[PDB]
Amino acid sequence: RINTVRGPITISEAGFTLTHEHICGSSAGFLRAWPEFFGSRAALVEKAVRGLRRARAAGVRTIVDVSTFDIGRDVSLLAEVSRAADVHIVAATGLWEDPPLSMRLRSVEELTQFFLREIQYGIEDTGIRAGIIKVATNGKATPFQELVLRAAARASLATGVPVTTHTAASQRDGEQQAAIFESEGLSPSRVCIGHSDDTDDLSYLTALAARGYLIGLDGIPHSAIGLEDNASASALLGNRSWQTRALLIKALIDQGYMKQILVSNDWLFGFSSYVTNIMDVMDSVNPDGMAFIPLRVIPFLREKGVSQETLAGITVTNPARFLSPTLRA
């Protein structure tokens, strides 16, 4: 079994799983302190329920919400939307790139305890346990990010839960990350190196994949084509097309790495940790939201000659093996 925001589910009930998504990309405490930023808490809920229902109609059964503490994860929000949409949501622990002082001053042992708490005991006072550990680098790891990476490995080794990562793909961050994880004795098959579709460097991806890493091609609909006059949207989403990102999926399949691929949208229904209009801009580019993978990417790859079975492997089996907790150390 895998832990979700509504309790444990069996591996087979996870079905078509999006491995890197967010209900709401925010900051710790922010959604409760200033819900009017999002219209209201009720408006965000409804928005997210409609978006998940759209993904569900397109075949999605589970999403992994990789929002950490410092992404302003609100597991009570996740539970409410999961119940109303009847889509499974796996919650995350870990730290992303905006830790407050109370986190940044912590030792590797302290961070370890924090992640274990969220995995073994629960998040806040909800009883909801995390099913994945999320970490981040944006180039060379800061000394604090290193501690975060080792604490994550240590927590993964003790619990069986997988690790997923945020990278600056163009800086090949995956290489440093792997080296740190391997230094802690963590198996590559329990690690997804994320935002790997942000780069066209196939030889970086294939080398990681040959090592047993999972390759997170998780931002397929991220693109500022048509929004070139909007510098903030362009900076965030990139000027590479969704088609270009999607052809990475095909390229890895073609080089023999199907079993190392994970795909997602990296979408959200609210977004406060960037410029004020950004969610509206993103919505105008990709109204399908989280349904983009099933409605757009799958048809595109099928007509390129990727089989239905290969795609079910990537979207159902590959996530099931990743999320299934392995034996404790």
Ligand X SMILES: C[C@@H](C[C@@H](C[C@H](CCC(=O)O)C(=O)O)C(=O)O)C(=O)O
Q: Identify which of residues 170 and 307 has a Cβ nearer to Zn ion in the complex.
A: 307
Q: Are 314 and 306 in contact (CB under 8 A)?
A: no
Token pair of 74 as six digits: 């609100």
CB atoms within 10 A of CB 40: 11
Burial annotation 288-311 (CB, 10 A radius, 16+ → b, else e): bbbbbbbbbbbebbeeeebeeeeb
Select the span of 162-170, 195-203, 271-279, 283-291 touching its own copies (CB under 8 A). 271-279
Of the ranges 111-119, 207-215, 286-294, 318-326, which one interacts with its own copies (CB under 8 A)?
A: 111-119
Which neighbouring-strand residues pair with 25?
271
Q: Is 148 a binder of its own copies (CB under 8 A)?
A: no
Residue 166 interacts with ligand X (CB under 6 A)? yes
Nearer to Zn ion, 157 or 204 (CB): 204
88 annotated ligand-binding residue = no
Q: Which of 15, 25, 99, 162 binds ligand X (CB under 6 A)?
A: 25
d(CA 114, CA 92) in angstroms, rounded, equals 12
Cβ closest to its own copies, residue 104 vs residue 250: 104
The answer to whether 290 touches 21, Cβ cutoff 8 Å, is: yes
Distances (CA, A) of 81 to 21, 68, 144: 14, 17, 33
Structure tokens at 328: 């404790």
Three-class secondary structure of residue 82 per DSSP: helix
Of 227, 236, 275, 312, the one binding its own copies (CB under 8 A) is 275
By rule CB under 8 A, what string of x and - marks binding of each residue 38-57 to its own copies? --------------------
Please, which residue, 2 or 169, has the CB nearer to ligand X?
A: 169
User: CA 134 to CA 22: how far, in whole Å?
Assistant: 12
Work out whether 22 is an interface residue with ligand X (CB under 6 A): yes
Contacts to ligand X by CB under 6 A: 22, 25, 166, 266, 268
Contacts to Zn ion by CB under 5 A: 166, 266, 306-307, 310
For the annotated binding site for Zn(2+), the residues are: 20, 22, 134, 166, 195, 266
